[PDB]
Amino acid sequence: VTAITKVEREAVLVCELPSFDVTDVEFDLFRARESTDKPLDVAAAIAYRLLLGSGLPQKFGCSDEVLLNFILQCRKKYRNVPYHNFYHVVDVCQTIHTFLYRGNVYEKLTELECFVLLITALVHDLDHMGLNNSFYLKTESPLGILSSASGNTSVLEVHHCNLAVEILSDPESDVFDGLEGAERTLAFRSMIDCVLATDMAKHGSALEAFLASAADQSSDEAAFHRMTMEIILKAGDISNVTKPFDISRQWAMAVTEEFYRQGDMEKERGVEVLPMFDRSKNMELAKGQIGFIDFVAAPFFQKIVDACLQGMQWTVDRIKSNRAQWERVLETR
Numbered sequence: 655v656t657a658i659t660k661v662e663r664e665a666v667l668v669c670e671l672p673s674f675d676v677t678d679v680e681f682d683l684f685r686a687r688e689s690t691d692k693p694l695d696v697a698a699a700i701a702y703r704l705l706l707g708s709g710l711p712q713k714f715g716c717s718d719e720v721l722l723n724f725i726l727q728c729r730k731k732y733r734n735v736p737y738h739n740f741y742h743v744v745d746v747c748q749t750i751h752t753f754l755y756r757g758n759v760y761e762k763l764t765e766l767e768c769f770v771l772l773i774t775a776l777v778h779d780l781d782h783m784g785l786n787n788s789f790y791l792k793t794e795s796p797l798g799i800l801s802s803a804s805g806n807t808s809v810l811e812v813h814h815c816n817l818a819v820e821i822l823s824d825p826e827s828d829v830f831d832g833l834e835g836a837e838r839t840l841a842f843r844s845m846i847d848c849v850l851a852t853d854m855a856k857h858g859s860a861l862e863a864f865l866a867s868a869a870d871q872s873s874d875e876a877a878f879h880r881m882t883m884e885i886i887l888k889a890g891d892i893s894n895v896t897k898p899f900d901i902s903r904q905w906a907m908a909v910t911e912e913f914y915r916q917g918d919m920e921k922e923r924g925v926e927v928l929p930m931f932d933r934s935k936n937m938e939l940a941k942g943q944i945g946f947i948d949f950v951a952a953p954f955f956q957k958i959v960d961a962c963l964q965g966m967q968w969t970v971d972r973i974k975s976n977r978a979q980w981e982r983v984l985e986t987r
């Protein structure tokens with residue numbers, strides 16, 4: 655791979671982010687992007703600052719410089735698609751920082767594990783092309799073939815891991831190079847396990863194992879740490895409905911357009927298109943958010959907060975509040 659030039663670093667370093675608390679639950683990434691031309695440098699600056707303000711890279715021998723390289727190597731592998739772009743992963747990073755520090759989930763993890771989560775956020779969707787795992791299987795594309803031949807149906811997640819492990823194999827972007835022995839091994843293994851658990855086909859399985867582990871006082875401790883890491887990245891990944899309504903709406907618009915584009919390409923190839931991806935059906939934003947809330951998000955956040963993440967209660971509160979707000983949009987459309 656190429657190296658990261660010194661001008662690119664200064665482009666990020668210069669951004670001062672006035673009037674923005676990056677650690678706050680109500681931080682608005684959309685506002686931050688509209689605040690300037692070159693939102694890709696403001697995005698990266700947000701990640702930079704989050705990782706410094708945690709105190710964590712310094713403790714694991716990661717320099718202010720290779721941190722910035724790592725971010726920019728990540729950024730360059732994100733494509734210009736409507737949802738699964740660089741801004742999604744910065745959002746997941748920032749959101750995870752709030753669960754750890756405002757939600758007190760840091761209490762349940764080592765410092766290394768907190769550092770790994772913040773890093774993993776930034777790699778967890780590398781080289782996403784706006785198409786889901788199903789698309790690669792039904793069209794027998796090379797990645798689908800390659801994943802089917804090695805056993806794993808998690809087509810993209812294996813791919814994102816391969817690219818994470820590739821970015822980290824260059825020493826000038828290796829944020830885990832300051833680690834040795836069991837610590838170094840654990841950074842890689844936990845990063846990879848977390849990215850693989852982002853496959854929503856495995857959603858129910860991962861939730862149910864975390865909850866079983868949290869109910870049991872005699873659970874293996876290392877295993878409960880690992881499941882909690884996985885649950886927190888999953889939580890970040892489905893965190894759009896836990897934000898102030900206007901932010902939550904903007905995320906829903908971006909996702910919807912990405913799904914519609916997949917559906918148009920499925921039509922071109924004669925492959926089957928589920929109704930969620932079908933632009934012509936022209937379903938309302940609101941009904942789809944309420945369905946996501948009821949089937950996926952509300953149960954997930956309610957169950958993990960009750961089982962053991964008590965500090966994350968606001969997520970359940972804001973899901974409820976956003977749901978009633980979408981109900982009001984239907985009732986008055």
Ligand SMILES: COc1ccc(C2=NN(C3CCN(C(=O)CN4C(=O)CC(C)(C)CC4=O)CC3)C(=O)[C@@H]3CC=CC[C@H]23)cc1OC
Pocket residue numbers: 852854891892894895902905906907909930942943945946949950
């Ligand atoms: C802002 O709103 C959204 C943000 C992200 C997503 C993603 N969706 N998914 C899958 C989640 C499971 N899924 C469902 O269709 C679940 N579901 C409903 O949504 C309502 C229903 C149709 C009535 C019944 C039902 O089963 C398929 C899509 C992903 O895998 C994406 C990538 C990773 C994580 C989440 C993200 C969806 C959003 O709004 C719908």
Ligand SMILES: [Mg+2]
Pocket residue numbers: 778779810852
């Ligand atoms: Mg993903």
Ligand SMILES: [Zn+2]
Pocket residue numbers: 742778779891
């Ligand atoms: Zn994601």
